[PDB]
Amino acid sequence: HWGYGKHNGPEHWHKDFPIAKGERQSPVDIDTHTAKYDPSLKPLSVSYDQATSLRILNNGHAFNVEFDDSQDKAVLKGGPLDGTYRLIQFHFHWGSLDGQGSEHTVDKKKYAAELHLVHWNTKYGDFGKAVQQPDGLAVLGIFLKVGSAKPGLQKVVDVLDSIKTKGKSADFTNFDPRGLLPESLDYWTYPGSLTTPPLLECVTWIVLKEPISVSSEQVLKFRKLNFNGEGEPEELMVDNWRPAQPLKNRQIKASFK
Ligand SMILES: NS(=O)(=O)c1nnc(-c2ccccc2Cl)s1
Ligand SMILES: [Zn+2]
């Protein structure tokens, strides 16, 4: 099966998922000097006051916090989007060391980790239909750098122990994802894909310019998770990130100059 190890990692994915070599794959390097400022872009509208988290899950590839998306509770609008996108889950990618871990890079700089808040376009009625459309998903990407602690993240950090191995889940209610946002919502955007299989080209990427800060201790706890299931030989969950892919015929746009 696919993974992030030497025998099943990203350069192998194309054998089972040939869209891996497609024309609008993610992530990409953001070259800040060739990004085009687009004054037509609207500000992002993040409406997460009525967010309802449900559960946190180790799926063997990351951990996901899941939200109730049966209603327009937590939604993303504005920016380069037309329409309303509902939050369904968030997850992270991170490294074995602080100098790597993000999926996107900025002028080839890697960050320690990357947060993805995944939303789907409610005109398609359910997530499974949305991933089959070119405008079906919008993923908000936020970089993490190591420095001070992020108080808003600690609640997540403290449950990881209970979902250490693949397939484990825990109740996770009343978590407010507003606690994970930077001060500024300035962004870059481009059309891209899921960065894990099935690698579908259905995502409008919105990558925030301002990183959030987390402490070494916090990121350290991420690295204690396991890719394996219980009773299996221990494989630490680290470096679950996909390299930058060719930009090909795409323009990255910026909401700021
Ligand atoms: N890293 S990511 O946000 O582009 C992403 N990639 N794959 C995702 C996915 C794949 C299968 C089912 C559900 C999701 Cl949410 S979400
Ligand atoms: Zn992701």
PDB file of N, CA and C in Angstrom, residues 173-222:
ATOM      1  N   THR A 173     -14.753  16.889  21.067  1.00  0.00           N
ATOM      2  CA  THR A 173     -15.791  17.882  20.860  1.00  0.00           C
ATOM      3  C   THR A 173     -15.334  19.242  21.372  1.00  0.00           C
ATOM      4  N   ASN A 174     -16.058  20.258  20.900  1.00  0.00           N
ATOM      5  CA  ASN A 174     -15.910  21.619  21.362  1.00  0.00           C
ATOM      6  C   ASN A 174     -14.523  22.178  21.094  1.00  0.00           C
ATOM      7  N   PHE A 175     -13.871  21.712  20.025  1.00  0.00           N
ATOM      8  CA  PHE A 175     -12.598  22.342  19.653  1.00  0.00           C
ATOM      9  C   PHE A 175     -12.875  23.492  18.688  1.00  0.00           C
ATOM     10  N   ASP A 176     -12.291  24.659  18.905  1.00  0.00           N
ATOM     11  CA  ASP A 176     -12.507  25.866  18.093  1.00  0.00           C
ATOM     12  C   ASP A 176     -11.331  26.073  17.163  1.00  0.00           C
ATOM     13  N   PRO A 177     -11.464  25.835  15.866  1.00  0.00           N
ATOM     14  CA  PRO A 177     -10.290  25.964  14.988  1.00  0.00           C
ATOM     15  C   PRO A 177      -9.864  27.415  14.766  1.00  0.00           C
ATOM     16  N   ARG A 178     -10.608  28.392  15.257  1.00  0.00           N
ATOM     17  CA  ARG A 178     -10.161  29.788  15.145  1.00  0.00           C
ATOM     18  C   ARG A 178      -8.852  30.035  15.877  1.00  0.00           C
ATOM     19  N   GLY A 179      -8.632  29.155  16.860  1.00  0.00           N
ATOM     20  CA  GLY A 179      -7.407  29.204  17.633  1.00  0.00           C
ATOM     21  C   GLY A 179      -6.192  28.862  16.810  1.00  0.00           C
ATOM     22  N   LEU A 180      -6.348  28.416  15.557  1.00  0.00           N
ATOM     23  CA  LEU A 180      -5.163  27.992  14.814  1.00  0.00           C
ATOM     24  C   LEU A 180      -4.787  29.001  13.739  1.00  0.00           C
ATOM     25  N   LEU A 181      -5.528  30.095  13.656  1.00  0.00           N
ATOM     26  CA  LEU A 181      -5.336  31.022  12.533  1.00  0.00           C
ATOM     27  C   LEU A 181      -4.291  32.077  12.846  1.00  0.00           C
ATOM     28  N   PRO A 182      -3.541  32.491  11.824  1.00  0.00           N
ATOM     29  CA  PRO A 182      -2.615  33.622  12.019  1.00  0.00           C
ATOM     30  C   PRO A 182      -3.415  34.919  12.154  1.00  0.00           C
ATOM     31  N   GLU A 183      -2.744  36.022  12.475  1.00  0.00           N
ATOM     32  CA  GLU A 183      -3.372  37.336  12.552  1.00  0.00           C
ATOM     33  C   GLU A 183      -3.883  37.802  11.195  1.00  0.00           C
ATOM     34  N   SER A 184      -3.018  37.682  10.183  1.00  0.00           N
ATOM     35  CA  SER A 184      -3.402  38.152   8.857  1.00  0.00           C
ATOM     36  C   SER A 184      -3.905  37.022   7.974  1.00  0.00           C
ATOM     37  N   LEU A 185      -4.887  37.283   7.125  1.00  0.00           N
ATOM     38  CA  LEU A 185      -5.395  36.299   6.175  1.00  0.00           C
ATOM     39  C   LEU A 185      -4.926  36.544   4.733  1.00  0.00           C
ATOM     40  N   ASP A 186      -3.820  37.246   4.490  1.00  0.00           N
ATOM     41  CA  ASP A 186      -3.249  37.415   3.165  1.00  0.00           C
ATOM     42  C   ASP A 186      -2.820  36.048   2.622  1.00  0.00           C
ATOM     43  N   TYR A 187      -2.998  35.860   1.304  1.00  0.00           N
ATOM     44  CA  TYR A 187      -2.770  34.512   0.809  1.00  0.00           C
ATOM     45  C   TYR A 187      -2.230  34.459  -0.612  1.00  0.00           C
ATOM     46  N   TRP A 188      -1.708  33.302  -0.970  1.00  0.00           N
ATOM     47  CA  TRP A 188      -1.472  32.890  -2.338  1.00  0.00           C
ATOM     48  C   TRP A 188      -2.513  31.854  -2.756  1.00  0.00           C
ATOM     49  N   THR A 189      -2.845  31.807  -4.049  1.00  0.00           N
ATOM     50  CA  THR A 189      -3.807  30.779  -4.487  1.00  0.00           C
ATOM     51  C   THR A 189      -3.418  30.279  -5.874  1.00  0.00           C
ATOM     52  N   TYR A 190      -3.708  29.013  -6.109  1.00  0.00           N
ATOM     53  CA  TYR A 190      -3.464  28.333  -7.374  1.00  0.00           C
ATOM     54  C   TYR A 190      -4.352  27.093  -7.423  1.00  0.00           C
ATOM     55  N   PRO A 191      -4.592  26.564  -8.624  1.00  0.00           N
ATOM     56  CA  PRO A 191      -5.417  25.371  -8.792  1.00  0.00           C
ATOM     57  C   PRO A 191      -4.576  24.104  -8.634  1.00  0.00           C
ATOM     58  N   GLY A 192      -4.998  23.137  -7.818  1.00  0.00           N
ATOM     59  CA  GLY A 192      -4.059  22.026  -7.650  1.00  0.00           C
ATOM     60  C   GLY A 192      -4.813  20.752  -7.346  1.00  0.00           C
ATOM     61  N   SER A 193      -4.183  19.907  -6.530  1.00  0.00           N
ATOM     62  CA  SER A 193      -4.724  18.575  -6.248  1.00  0.00           C
ATOM     63  C   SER A 193      -4.677  18.183  -4.768  1.00  0.00           C
ATOM     64  N   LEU A 194      -5.316  17.055  -4.425  1.00  0.00           N
ATOM     65  CA  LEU A 194      -5.023  16.346  -3.174  1.00  0.00           C
ATOM     66  C   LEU A 194      -3.534  16.001  -3.171  1.00  0.00           C
ATOM     67  N   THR A 195      -2.878  16.086  -2.011  1.00  0.00           N
ATOM     68  CA  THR A 195      -1.458  15.739  -1.980  1.00  0.00           C
ATOM     69  C   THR A 195      -1.263  14.305  -1.476  1.00  0.00           C
ATOM     70  N   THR A 196      -2.341  13.577  -1.209  1.00  0.00           N
ATOM     71  CA  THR A 196      -2.194  12.141  -0.970  1.00  0.00           C
ATOM     72  C   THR A 196      -3.106  11.414  -1.958  1.00  0.00           C
ATOM     73  N   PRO A 197      -2.836  10.145  -2.246  1.00  0.00           N
ATOM     74  CA  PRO A 197      -3.793   9.398  -3.078  1.00  0.00           C
ATOM     75  C   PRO A 197      -5.214   9.519  -2.573  1.00  0.00           C
ATOM     76  N   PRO A 198      -6.219   9.632  -3.425  1.00  0.00           N
ATOM     77  CA  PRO A 198      -6.151   9.444  -4.873  1.00  0.00           C
ATOM     78  C   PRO A 198      -5.673  10.622  -5.718  1.00  0.00           C
ATOM     79  N   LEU A 199      -5.145  11.695  -5.149  1.00  0.00           N
ATOM     80  CA  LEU A 199      -4.405  12.745  -5.835  1.00  0.00           C
ATOM     81  C   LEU A 199      -5.262  13.493  -6.847  1.00  0.00           C
ATOM     82  N   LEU A 200      -6.571  13.496  -6.633  1.00  0.00           N
ATOM     83  CA  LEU A 200      -7.534  14.115  -7.543  1.00  0.00           C
ATOM     84  C   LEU A 200      -7.286  15.607  -7.695  1.00  0.00           C
ATOM     85  N   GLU A 201      -7.441  16.070  -8.938  1.00  0.00           N
ATOM     86  CA  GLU A 201      -7.194  17.478  -9.267  1.00  0.00           C
ATOM     87  C   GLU A 201      -8.430  18.334  -9.097  1.00  0.00           C
ATOM     88  N   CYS A 202      -8.857  18.536  -7.846  1.00  0.00           N
ATOM     89  CA  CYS A 202     -10.151  19.102  -7.511  1.00  0.00           C
ATOM     90  C   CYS A 202     -10.030  20.214  -6.476  1.00  0.00           C
ATOM     91  N   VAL A 203      -8.815  20.709  -6.249  1.00  0.00           N
ATOM     92  CA  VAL A 203      -8.594  21.636  -5.140  1.00  0.00           C
ATOM     93  C   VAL A 203      -8.200  23.026  -5.602  1.00  0.00           C
ATOM     94  N   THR A 204      -8.859  24.026  -5.034  1.00  0.00           N
ATOM     95  CA  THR A 204      -8.374  25.399  -5.065  1.00  0.00           C
ATOM     96  C   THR A 204      -7.538  25.570  -3.798  1.00  0.00           C
ATOM     97  N   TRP A 205      -6.254  25.766  -3.974  1.00  0.00           N
ATOM     98  CA  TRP A 205      -5.377  25.944  -2.828  1.00  0.00           C
ATOM     99  C   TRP A 205      -5.324  27.412  -2.425  1.00  0.00           C
ATOM    100  N   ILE A 206      -5.480  27.614  -1.122  1.00  0.00           N
ATOM    101  CA  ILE A 206      -5.325  28.939  -0.534  1.00  0.00           C
ATOM    102  C   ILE A 206      -4.259  28.817   0.549  1.00  0.00           C
ATOM    103  N   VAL A 207      -3.082  29.360   0.285  1.00  0.00           N
ATOM    104  CA  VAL A 207      -1.996  29.186   1.236  1.00  0.00           C
ATOM    105  C   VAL A 207      -1.729  30.523   1.918  1.00  0.00           C
ATOM    106  N   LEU A 208      -1.850  30.536   3.242  1.00  0.00           N
ATOM    107  CA  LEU A 208      -1.671  31.782   4.000  1.00  0.00           C
ATOM    108  C   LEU A 208      -0.218  32.182   4.052  1.00  0.00           C
ATOM    109  N   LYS A 209       0.003  33.475   3.945  1.00  0.00           N
ATOM    110  CA  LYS A 209       1.402  33.963   3.934  1.00  0.00           C
ATOM    111  C   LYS A 209       2.086  33.974   5.283  1.00  0.00           C
ATOM    112  N   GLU A 210       1.295  34.240   6.302  1.00  0.00           N
ATOM    113  CA  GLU A 210       1.829  34.340   7.656  1.00  0.00           C
ATOM    114  C   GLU A 210       1.845  32.990   8.371  1.00  0.00           C
ATOM    115  N   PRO A 211       2.978  32.483   8.819  1.00  0.00           N
ATOM    116  CA  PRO A 211       2.970  31.192   9.535  1.00  0.00           C
ATOM    117  C   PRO A 211       2.496  31.391  10.971  1.00  0.00           C
ATOM    118  N   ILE A 212       2.039  30.309  11.587  1.00  0.00           N
ATOM    119  CA  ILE A 212       1.817  30.372  13.025  1.00  0.00           C
ATOM    120  C   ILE A 212       3.037  29.746  13.696  1.00  0.00           C
ATOM    121  N   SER A 213       3.239  30.108  14.951  1.00  0.00           N
ATOM    122  CA  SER A 213       4.360  29.599  15.737  1.00  0.00           C
ATOM    123  C   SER A 213       3.917  28.484  16.679  1.00  0.00           C
ATOM    124  N   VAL A 214       4.672  27.393  16.774  1.00  0.00           N
ATOM    125  CA  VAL A 214       4.411  26.345  17.751  1.00  0.00           C
ATOM    126  C   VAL A 214       5.714  26.035  18.484  1.00  0.00           C
ATOM    127  N   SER A 215       5.624  25.458  19.694  1.00  0.00           N
ATOM    128  CA  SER A 215       6.904  25.212  20.372  1.00  0.00           C
ATOM    129  C   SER A 215       7.522  23.897  19.942  1.00  0.00           C
ATOM    130  N   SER A 216       8.815  23.745  20.254  1.00  0.00           N
ATOM    131  CA  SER A 216       9.488  22.482  19.968  1.00  0.00           C
ATOM    132  C   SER A 216       8.763  21.326  20.648  1.00  0.00           C
ATOM    133  N   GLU A 217       8.362  21.538  21.897  1.00  0.00           N
ATOM    134  CA  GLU A 217       7.638  20.528  22.656  1.00  0.00           C
ATOM    135  C   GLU A 217       6.377  20.067  21.931  1.00  0.00           C
ATOM    136  N   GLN A 218       5.610  21.017  21.401  1.00  0.00           N
ATOM    137  CA  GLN A 218       4.368  20.679  20.711  1.00  0.00           C
ATOM    138  C   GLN A 218       4.616  19.801  19.495  1.00  0.00           C
ATOM    139  N   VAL A 219       5.565  20.183  18.629  1.00  0.00           N
ATOM    140  CA  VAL A 219       5.892  19.424  17.430  1.00  0.00           C
ATOM    141  C   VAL A 219       6.522  18.065  17.771  1.00  0.00           C
ATOM    142  N   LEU A 220       7.199  18.046  18.899  1.00  0.00           N
ATOM    143  CA  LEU A 220       7.801  16.800  19.354  1.00  0.00           C
ATOM    144  C   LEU A 220       6.752  15.719  19.577  1.00  0.00           C
ATOM    145  N   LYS A 221       5.611  16.126  20.107  1.00  0.00           N
ATOM    146  CA  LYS A 221       4.509  15.211  20.364  1.00  0.00           C
ATOM    147  C   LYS A 221       3.885  14.664  19.098  1.00  0.00           C
ATOM    148  N   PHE A 222       3.913  15.462  18.025  1.00  0.00           N
ATOM    149  CA  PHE A 222       3.465  14.944  16.737  1.00  0.00           C
ATOM    150  C   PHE A 222       4.300  13.735  16.313  1.00  0.00           C
TER     151      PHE A 222
END
